[model samples]
Target chain A: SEVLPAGLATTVLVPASSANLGPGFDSLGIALSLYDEIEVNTTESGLKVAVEGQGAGEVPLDGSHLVVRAIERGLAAGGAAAPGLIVQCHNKIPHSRGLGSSAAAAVAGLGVANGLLAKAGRAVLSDDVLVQLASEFEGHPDNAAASVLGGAVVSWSETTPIYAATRLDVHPDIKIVAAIPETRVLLPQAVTHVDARFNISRVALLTVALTARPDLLMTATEDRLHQPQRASAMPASADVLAYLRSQGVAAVLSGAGPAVLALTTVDLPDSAVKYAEDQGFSLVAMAVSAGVSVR
Target chain B: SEVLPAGLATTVLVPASSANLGPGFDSLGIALSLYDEIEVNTTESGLKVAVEGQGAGEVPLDGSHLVVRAIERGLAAGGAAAPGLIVQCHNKIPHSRGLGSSAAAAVAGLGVANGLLAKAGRAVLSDDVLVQLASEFEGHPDNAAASVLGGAVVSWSETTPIYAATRLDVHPDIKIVAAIPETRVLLPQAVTHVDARFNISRVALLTVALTARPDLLMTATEDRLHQPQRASAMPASADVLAYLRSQGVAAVLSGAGPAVLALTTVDLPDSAVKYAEDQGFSLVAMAVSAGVSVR
Candidate 1:
C-alpha cells in the first residue's frame, strides 16, 4: 500500500535488469538504471494498449501486446476481474539486446494489475506473488525477480513452483559499465563437463566476492559455461572478453547477450578499453536502479 | 603475530573441518569442535615427533611425521631453514572419515612452522601463504581453509597458485549434527551432466541461504555431486540422507565421505537421530569452532 496506492490510475515503472551476473547463470541478477513506464487506468469496458519509445513500431499496440497479456494474467492470479484497462507504455529499454526489456514489461503489467486489485478491495497481491506470476510467464525467474524487487538477487526454482529469490547486498562502490553491441547471441543450453566444473566453483566464490571481498572479482568472474559456448555467435565479444581478462578486468556477457558487462570501482581505464574495440557498441557506466515503482 | 608471536614458544591447536558442505563441492567448508594439537620446541638442531590419540601407536615418531614435513615446507616458503623441531601431537580428529583430519594436520604443520620462523627472527609464513601451501599439498582448499580460519567458508582456486577463501556467517541458530560412520568412501572423479548442473545452482543459492536466510536451507543443501556417486561405498549413509530429505531436514555427506552432516537450528530432532542410527558409528552435536590457534 505504501507504493502505487489503490483507488485511482497509476503508472508503473520497472527497471531493466542483467541476469546471470558472471558464473551465477540463471540465478543471480541485478537491476539497472534503464526502465520502462506503463500508464494504466480503469476503463468502462474494452481493452486498450499503446506502445512507444524503444520498441514503438515493433510491439503490438492492442490486446495482443505482452503488457496486455501480463495484466490479464496478473489479474487472474490475484482473483480480481478488472473493469478493463486503458494502458500506455513508454519503453526506453532495448528489446532483444539482453537488457531484460521483456522482464520489465511483465513486471510493469503485473504491478498495474496488483494496484487494480488493491482498489477493488480484493486481497492485495503481494510483491512475492507478483514475482511468482511474472517469473512463471517469463519462463525464467532471475530477470523477472530482479526487475520486481530491484537490486541483486540469487534465484532458484527446481521441483517447486514457488521459486525462491534471495537478495544479496551489492557493494556501493561497484558500478556497471555495459557495452551493448548491435549483435545478439542466444544462450546455449549444452556445455562440456570441464566447463560446467569451471562454472560451479566460480559461482560459489562469486557470492563471497560480492558480499565482502571485491579483490577476488577477477577469478570469480571466470566462466566456462554459456560465455564460451555462446561466444561463437559473437566472436568480437569473445575476443574482447579474453583481452579484458588478460588485463585483470572483470567482464561477463550480459544475459544471453551481445552486451558485455564490466564491473569496476572507478571509470574504466583506457587500457581496459584498448582491447575491446568500439564497433557499434554503446558503452556507458550506469547505476544499479531500484526495483519496480510508480513514476 | 599475537596468535603465534615472535620470541615465544607455542603449541598450535587447529580444528578439523568438513568440506563440500551441501551443494558447494571443492569450495565450501565448516570447522567443527574436533581438533588436533601439536607442541613444538625450538631446539638447537635435529628433528623429533611424539604422537598420541587417534593414530597414536601407528603415526611416525621420526622426522617423517606430518608436522615435521609441514615445518620443512613452511621454512622453505619463508626462505628460512629450521634449526630444529621437537614436536608432540595429541590428535583426536579421526583420519579417513571425511572429517578433514588430514587437512587439520597440514594446517597445524604450516601454522607451527610459521610460528617457529617468527621466533627465530626470520620472516614468518603468512596465513595466506600457509593456506596456499596447505591447499597445494592436500589438493583442496575448502577443508584446509576452514580448519585454518574456522566458521563456515566458501573458497575457490583457479589457474593461479594463490587460492581465495571467503567467510560466510552462519546464523547463530544454526547447529551441525554429524554422524561419522565406520565405513569409508573415496570420491569418484566422474559424474553425469545433469548431476553437475544440479550442484552448480544449489551451490550458488547456498550462499544466499548462509548470508541472511535460513528457510532456504532445505533446498540449498540439495546435491548431485560426490554424495550420490559415492553412495555405493556407503549405502546406509545414502539411505538415511534420502529419508532426512523426505522430512525436509537439511543434510549431506560430509566431505568425500560416509559421515552424514545434518544442519539444523535446534538439537537434532529425535526423528533425525533415528535415521542416523543403525551402526556403532560415532554421532555427536558439535559447535563451529575457531580456526587454527597457538596455545
Candidate 2:
C-alpha cells in the first residue's frame, strides 16, 4: 500500500479537459496537458482559500469558492466533517474558456477530501465513487470523467442518476490545437433537427478516426450540433473553425464554445495561429492528458 | 507470384452483409457467413447466366443481371475485350431481405472478372477499384464494403464518386443472430433530419463498442435512422427487433431492414428464435465472414 500523508496534507493535480469533443455532444470528453494544482491541508477554522495564476481576484476567496464547496461536499459524502481546511490553488487553466476548468476544480476538491480520509484511515475513495461524486458536484459527468480518468472517455447517463463511462486510449501522435477566444457563447436549449443529424454521423466517425485512423480526423470531426447554433454568439470561434477546416484541419467547437479544437497529427499550421490572431484570440497546443493525480 | 489461372475461368465467393449496423447509417457495415457464389468463365459469344437460391428466376438471366453487368464493367474498365461471359450463381442468401444478396452478387461478378483479367495478364483489379465499381453497381457502398472486405467496416464517401472503407475486426467471441423475414423493405429517397441525427450518435459508439468492448454494444447499437421508418414496411421485422432487444439483445436492422441482426457474445437464446418464428420469420446464427474469396 502507498504511504498516507503525515498530517492530513496532500496535493492534487487535475488536468484541463474538452468536452462534447466533436459530435459526442454531452457524452464524450478528453483531458489535455494543461493543469491546475491545489495543495490542501487541515486547519482549525472553517475554510481557507488562496489563488494564483488564471483567476486570482476574480474567483471567490471564501466557502463560496468552487473548490471549497467541492471539498465540503466530498467530506460530507465521506461520512466526515469539514473539520477545517487550508487550500492553495496555483491555477494555469483559463477560466470560463470552455476548456473544462470547472471539472478540474471539482476533482481537486474531491481528491483532497478523499486524501484526508485515507490519511486518517477513515475511508479510501475508489476511482468509481470519486467519478460519481465529482460528476454530481460538477453537473457535467463527461468532463469530470475525462478529468478523473484521463485520455479519451465515452460517458453516458440517459435516465440514471449515475454516469457510466468507458475509456479509450488515444493515438499517441494525436495533437490537440485549441484556439481560445476572449468572448464566450452560451449553450442553447434547442438545435435544428438537420444540425443534430449532421452531428450524429460525424461524431460516430470521430471515435474510430481518433483511436484507429488519424487520417480520418478531418472528416470525422465535422459537427452540426452545438457549434453552428452557438456560432453567432462566437462568430470568431466559428470563423476559426471554418478557417482551420479550409486548411484541411479537423476542427470542432471546443466544449460550450469560444474555443475551437483542431485535431491534427502534428502541431497546427502557422496559418492556424494567424487565423486565431485575426479573431484576437490566443492559441495553445497540447497532447492528451494522462489524467488526475494526487501527492 | 502465385500461379495465375491457365484459362479465363474463375469462381468467387462473396458473403452477405449487414449495413448501418446501428447508428453508422450509411457509413458502417459487416459481412456475414451467408454467401452468394458465382462461377464465371470467358465465352467467345454473348453472356449466359443462371442463378440458384435467392433471386433465382426473378433475377434476370440476361446482361441486365447485376452479376453480369459487374463483370462487363470490370472487363471494360480493364481494357479487355468484352470477351463474353458464362455466369452461374449459387446464392444461399435471401434476396431483398436486407442481407446484402445484391451486394454479394455485384462483388462476385466483379471479383470473378478481376480474377479472369489477372489470369490473362491483361490487368489486375485492386480492392479499391473493385469497391468503387461494386458500390456504383449496388448503390450502397456500406454493404458493398462489408461484402468485399469481410468482417466489420467503416465506410464513407463525401462528394466523391469513389467509396472509402476501413475494415474493423470484431471480437473473436462475437456471434450474429439474424432474424430474416420473408418480407423486404425498400430503400427510401429521403429521411427526416431528426431521424438522421438519432442514428449519428449510435453509429459512432458502435465502432468502438463492437470492436473493443462488447459490453457497450447494448447501448452503442441503438439506431434512429432507417429502422424505425422502414419498420412500417416490415412490421414483423420491427416486432422481432423489439422482442430481441427486450431480452437485452444488441439487435439492429440489418441493412435497410426486413432482417434484424443481433450482435452478441453468445448465441441467440432459444426464446429469440421461438419469438421470431411465431412472427413467421426464420432465424439463423452466423459468424463474421472473412470477406470475399476467389479460386
Which candidate's DockQ is highest? 1
What are the TM-scores, per candidate, against the unseen true structure? 0.93, 0.90
Residue runs of model 2 more than 4 Å from their true location after superposition? A1-7, A137-139, A183-198, B1-7, B160-162, B183-201
Candidate 1 lDDT over A1-295, as tens digits, reads 2222233687888989998877888787889988798989886677777888988999987787888888888877777666667899988888887799888888898888877766766676777887888888788789998998888888777764676576778888788888777644454445554566667889888877776777778888887666777777777877766666777778887888777888775677786665455655677677887889853
lDDT of 1 at B292: 92
Candidate 2 lDDT score relative to the true structure: 0.79
Which residue pairs collide, candidate 1?
Answer: A150-A291
In Å, residue B66's CA in model 2 sits off its true spot by 1.1
- Per-model C-alpha lDDT, please? 0.78, 0.79
DockQ of 2: 0.30
Stretches off by above 4 angstroms in model 1 are: A1-8, A183-194, A270-277, B1-8, B183-195
Alpha-carbon error at B38 in model 1, in Å?
Answer: 0.6
Q: What does the i-RMS of model 2 come to?
A: 4.7
* Residues A34-145 of candidate 2: C-alpha lDDT, one tens digit per residue: 9999999886655779999988899999998988888877777777765678899999989888898888899888888787777777775778777887788776578898
Candidate 1 is graded, for docking, as acceptable
